[PDB]
Design a protein around this ligand. Structure first.
Ligand SMILES: O=P(O)(O)OC[C@H]1O[C@@H](n2ccnc2)[C@H](O)[C@@H]1O
Ligand SMILES: O=P(O)(O)OC[C@H]1O[C@@H](n2ccnc2)[C@H](O)[C@@H]1O
Ligand SMILES: [Fe+2]
Ligand SMILES: [Fe+2]
Lengths: 471, 471
């Protein structure tokens, strides 16, 4: 369906601002919901990106002049953190500031201090910049993966188009098997939102699924390949240390992280330290040339309520903080990945320890799921946890669909997950008293009170569901 | 569908215990989930009630000998609170204690002090007793209403059967229009769970929808009619005082409570104090003869995030506490109704004030909805709030379906609402570290880890959804 079909009475708009240092004109997307009865139109965030673009051609390379100008000026490092620490407000920073209705200097400050990141690989020229950080709107990530068999470019690109239509702020391409490189190229050239990956997945594919045949060298080659395409952030499980693995022996559900499992298998096979940890500095050198942000994985994530907040989980968290501070020494942007399965009373401890041990780097959670009892409904069990941990400061929420623990999500499942997570994210924005967040609730509630039905539906997260249910 | 179809590998069971004082044998329901691989069967709560019973005959009158014996002994008041304060452990108390795996004296103590209620009108002989209170499992209420046109007894009774099959602990019959008395009779004779009502709805129908023609007398007659049938609890909006009505003038969504609106209209028409407030003592006299519990309504509930925790809402809460203490002086069981629409940061204040101002009487919330932005998904927006406020001590959660704000729920909508609320309730049980609550999560997670797929599905809230999604 088209944008207009998904969001009746809404139009795509852009706010034009000038980047003072370069003279570059930025066109920052938003949506406008047109209302009745003398109400002013309501302006809202928009991640849906350019519409009706031929996937064989790809999106406009909107960042090209920004990247070209900085290259011509010359620079030792290419990261938003490097520029921020030099006192430079970049186009990306101004774009995010405009998008967030906040001051560009505030954005620069948050990025410089490591409390926000702008995942924006210089090779992802199609990207509409966005920011992740506790001082900003809570963001949502959706995961995609290519088809088991050969699919068309239209079919692959629709996965990003659909997730972002419903509000996904980032996506990750978690493809395995064949065609990883080719389909990721299709995604990046056609994605207006940041695209992350977990590079160890493709590295494992390069060695035919034999974890014991992994090593730094094939991982390094994989990082460069993905960076060259434009991947904006890498999940890297560098905190799964050899000595932490035995801490999982008494767990109910062991190591549930896919990347964590792979590293653990390699570590145990050789009794050697995690190669991503050992080569952390070399990873930073790669990231600095492209601006790939590092999402430090939580390979020792709890996979059951029983395992929540255990010794293994927090051992890794402590190391995530060390790795964070090391990355910042080289001006590499960082966020930290978090749980997982966590009952509600254990959520505050997670945020307290992360904020302290990781120097307020942005936190990126998978839920958490607040109970294990409802497979088929884990978008709900985890929306509860995501809203809670978002309220306490978590900056990015990885979605969970109704098919979690069960199977691959179809389009209905993906939409259900994104909607549930947009609810959690906005509920968290309200809880944080984020500026102007309540204006959205107020506009819909005013429409409800005044029986402006179409306006109520048009203002909601999913207008056609509301309208259909009413009919 | 049958119990077996809804819960494959589960059997309905009963734990037999003897009430020492009377010699009465109680058969307390539970379910048993039969597992594989040498796992012991897992025993869980069961509200589904007796299966395959002809609705034209009705359920067994299991409480008859209990009520008959107490009548023969003679008593001035018939409430569980009266008996508890006399030091008597009743069959109802022992039944609830067994059902909750807690001590009968503990149950008696909680009821005597007003911190738990056992809604159990002596005329509802079909009832399998249950308890509502912060020291017990968090409970869920589902609402039903009779058909707009003439429906069969099978069709009406299926509404209760369906809601309880998925875990509803109480129901309320909120029917309006024609046939209110007749269909409520069908429900009560065929309901194993407590049945509540909002008596002002039928009182309004008796005066042909003209609120100005209400008065104490027609309300009183309605209370007696409903009590005689066996209604276990009444929502009564006695805290909507005349002087509180102007406090709503600056609200965004005014008075959203149906009962509250009716009382407000009458109060404003005559400039006279709420007649349910004025006749509170007379209401208590009725309740004492049947054991009808009072659910003190929140007619000044906030209906939008904008109105949350405002002066009007808390003025009524203060009065709810006064009414609670007055009811206890006459040994009438009480719970208090709460919000509503409340953003997450405002939830703790709601619980703090209720616990203090209402002397820890059980709290009964409608959600709360944590954001207004997602009509069509208000089971999710409110599951977040319900889980949170449940974790802080709320004892009964009134469900919200995906059709909230939009239309009448079908069977799929009702199931979705009950499931979402069972998730919230159990998540709250975990957060409170309620004894043995985590054993359920652990059993499912162990099955997951060990690839015992059927066991995983059988242990879940909705086995056939999990199984189908996996397939
Ligand atoms: O390889 P593992 O299982 O750790 O990661 C799977 C996915 O989960 C996401 N995630 C987010 C927080 N913790 C894990 C991560 O970014 C990736 O999308
Ligand atoms: O008449 P009003 O709208 O107050 O009540 C509608 C329903 O909402 C329930 N409720 C629960 C808490 N507050 C309200 C109440 O028990 C009844 O089922
Ligand atoms: Fe999981
Ligand atoms: Fe509402």
């Amino acid at each position: 369906p088209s944008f207009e079909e998904c969001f009746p009475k809404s139009t795509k708009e852009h706010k034009e601002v000038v980047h003072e240092e370069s003279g570059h004109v930025l066109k920052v997307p938003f949506r406008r919901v047109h209302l009745s009865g003398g109400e002013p139109a309501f302006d809202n965030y928009d991640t849906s990106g350019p519409q009706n673009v031929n996937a064989h051609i790809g999106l406009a390379k909107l960042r090209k002049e920004w990247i070209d100008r900085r290259e011509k000026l010359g620079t030792p490092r290419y990261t938003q953190m490097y520029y921020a620490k030099q006192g430079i407000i970049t186009e990306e920073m101004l774009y995010c500031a405009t998008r967030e209705k906040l001051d560009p200097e505030f954005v620069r400050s948050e990025v410089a201090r490591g409390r926000a990141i702008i995942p924006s690989n210089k090779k992802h020229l199609e990207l509409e910049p966005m920011i992740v950080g506790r001082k900003f709107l809570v963001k949502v990530n959706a995961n995609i993966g290519n088809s088991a068999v050969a699919s068309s470019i239209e079919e692959e690109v629709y996965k990003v188009q659909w997730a972002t239509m419903w509000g996904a702020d980032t996506i990750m391409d978690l493809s395995t098997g064949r065609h990883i490189h080719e389909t990721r190229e299709w995604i990046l050239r056609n994605s207006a939102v940041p695209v992350g990956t977990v590079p160890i997945y493709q590295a494992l594919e390069k060695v035919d699924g034999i974890a014991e045949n992994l090593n730094w060298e094939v991982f390094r080659e994989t990082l460069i390949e993905q960076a060259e395409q434009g991947v904006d952030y890498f999940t890297i499980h560098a905190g799964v240390l050899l000595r932490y693995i035995p801490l999982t022996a008494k767990r109910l559900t062991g190591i549930v992280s896919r990347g964590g499992s792979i590293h653990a298998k390699w570590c145990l096979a050789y009794h050697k330290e995690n190669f991503a940890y050992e080569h952390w500095d070399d990873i930073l050198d790669i990231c600095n040339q492209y601006d790939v942000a590092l999402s430090i994985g939580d390979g020792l994530r709890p996979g059951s309520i029983y395992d929540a907040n255990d010794t293994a989980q927090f051992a890794e968290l402590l190391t995530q903080g060390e790795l964070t501070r090391r990355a910042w020494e080289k001006d590499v942007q960082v966020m930290n990945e978090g749980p997982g399965h966590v009952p509600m009373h254990k959520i505050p401890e997670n945020m307290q320890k992360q904020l302290e041990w990781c120097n307020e780097a942005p936190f990126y959670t998978l839920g958490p799921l607040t109970t294990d009892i409802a497979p088929g409904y884990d978008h709900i069990t985890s929306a509860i946890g995501a809203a809670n941990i978002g309220a306490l400061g978590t900056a990015l929420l990885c979605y969970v669909t109704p098919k979690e623990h069960l199977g691959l999500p179809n389009r209905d499942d993906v939409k259900a997950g994104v909607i549930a997570y947009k609810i959690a994210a906005h509920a968290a924005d309200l809880a944080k008293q984020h500026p102007h967040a309540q204006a959205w609730d107020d506009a819909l509630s005013k429409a409800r009170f005044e029986f402006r039905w179409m306006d109520q539906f048009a203002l909601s997260l999913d207008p056609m569901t509301a309208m259909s249910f009413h009919d």
